[PDB]
DNA sequence: GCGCGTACGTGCGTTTAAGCGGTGCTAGAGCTGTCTACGACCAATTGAGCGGCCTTCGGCACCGGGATTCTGATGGGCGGCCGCGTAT
């Protein structure tokens, strides 16, 4: 669960991962949240976002989903 | 010191609401930008304010004069002294 990530970061962070999937990924609307920086701490290889959030009301949402998986792109 | 009483500490179970991190929204602080009113400053004149000096009537508490009330020597008259004293 989302709260179990913020509550337990040392147990899940000490394990290596390679694939990450999330349903209803609208929680990453702002790039200044604890979950946004928390998911970026896990050393993974590939990610996958399965959601249908409106990426047109704010550019920080689409850009947040761009740099969330590809750090460097605009 | 001692003794009576009971209330408050310690426990468990039940229960209730803080704390967490999640998002959204807009209000109200903070910044910013132009104008100008109100306060500082310098001037000259004026009387409120301070030192210097002594004021007057009213109120607390001691006072003042005059009629009136109570105590003391005075005094004739009715009675009692029984004891020295003159007359036959």
From Swiss-Prot:
Q: What happens when the gene is disrupted?
A: Decreased sensitivity to the cytotoxic effects of 6-azauracil.
Q: Where is this motif: DEAH box?
A: 23-26
Q: Where in the cell is it found?
A: Nucleus
Which top-rank group of organisms is this from? Eukaryota
Oligomeric state and interaction partners are given as: Component of the 1.8 MDa SAGA complex, which consists of at least of TRA1, CHD1, SPT7, TAF5, ADA3, SGF73, SPT20/ADA5, SPT8, TAF12, TAF6, HFI1/ADA1, UBP8, GCN5, ADA2, SPT3, SGF29, TAF10, TAF9, SGF11 and SUS1. TAF5, TAF6, TAF9, TAF19, TAF12 and ADA1 seem to be present in 2 copies. SAGA is built of 5 distinct domains with specialized functions. Domain I (containing TRA1) probably represents the activator interaction surface.
Note on domains (UniProt): The 2 chromodomains are involved in the binding to the histone H3 methyllysine at position 4 (H3K4me3).
Role: ATP-dependent chromatin-remodeling factor which functions as substrate recognition component of the transcription regulatory histone acetylation (HAT) complexes SAGA and SLIK. It recognizes H3K4me. SAGA is involved in RNA polymerase II-dependent transcriptional regulation of approximately 10% of yeast genes. At the promoters, SAGA is required for recruitment of the basal transcription machinery.
Q: What else is known?
A: Present with 1620 molecules/cell in log phase SD medium.
Q: Which family does it belong to?
A: Belongs to the SNF2/RAD54 helicase family.
Q: What is this protein called?
A: Chromo domain-containing protein 1
Organism for this UniProt entry: Saccharomyces cerevisiae (strain ATCC 204508 / S288c)
The shown residues of the full protein are 491 to 564 of 1468
